[PDB]
């Protein structure tokens, strides 16, 4: 009921009714676990399916484990934290749908942040919100540029190995902002470059490009 910091699960829950969550939380604390202060401090994400919530899409880049709530129920039953293996989230439908293995995503996340050394400019009208995209980009190691980059900035990033790659993200409602960029032959991608990219831990410069 009281463990060392490196032995304490820091848990996020996603996709549950408020009352279920209340109950899971009581159980968690009795066991000496805690609710995570944020994705970045989370060790375990509890989810019963692959679900594209902000929690899932930030957590996936940092957590050690994505498990079903059955894990926590068995832990509480045994009054100890048991091994995660038998409770790893396996969503056959989502995996076929998005052509990935969640296990493979976690492995890649641990090796390296998907957006290591990448800067994103994201137009203001984006959906989900700019704040959401930003939190997802950052957990994955990227940075979001607050100012729209000039043609000069874009070229200079490309010409210097010492400078991060810049990636532009937009949506239908904002494409008028990018007209001059397209004329220049600059790529702009839709939000899925980030959303689906982080879920599957892949960079896909072709599926989501407006060009």
């Amino acid at each position: 009921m009281k463990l060392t910091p490196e032995l304490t699960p820091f848990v996020l829950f996603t996709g549950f009714e408020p009352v279920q969550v209340q109950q899971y939380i009581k159980k968690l604390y009795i066991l000496g676990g805690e609710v995570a202060e944020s994705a970045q401090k989370c060790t375990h994400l509890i989810a019963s399916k692959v679900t594209r919530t902000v929690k899932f899409l930030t957590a996936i880049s940092v957590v050690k484990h994505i498990v079903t709530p059955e894990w926590l129920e068995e832990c509480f039953r045994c009054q100890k934290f048991i091994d995660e293996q038998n409770y790893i989230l396996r969503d056959a439908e989502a995996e076929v749908l998005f052509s990935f293995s969640l296990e493979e995503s976690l492995k890649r996340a641990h090796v390296s942040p998907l957006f290591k050394a990448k800067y994103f400019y994201i137009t203001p009208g984006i959906c989900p919100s700019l704040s959401t995209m930003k939190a997802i980009v950052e957990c994955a190691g990227g940075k979001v540029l607050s100012k729209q980059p000039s043609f000069r900035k874009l070229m200079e990033h490309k010409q210097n190995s010492s400078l991060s790659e810049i990636i532009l993200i937009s949506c239908e409602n904002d494409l008028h902002l990018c007209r001059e960029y397209f004329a220049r032959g600059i790529d702009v991608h839709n939000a899925e470059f980030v959303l689906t990219g982080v879920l599957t831990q892949t960079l896909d410069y072709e599926s989501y490009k407006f060009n």
Binding site: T14, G15, R52, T53, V54, L57, C127, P128, T132, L195
Partner: peptide, 10 residues
């Protein structure tokens, strides 16, 4: 839709 607490999927 009625407002709810549910976490939105994207």
């Amino acid at each position: 839709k009625k407002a709810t607490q549910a976490s939105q999927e994207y």
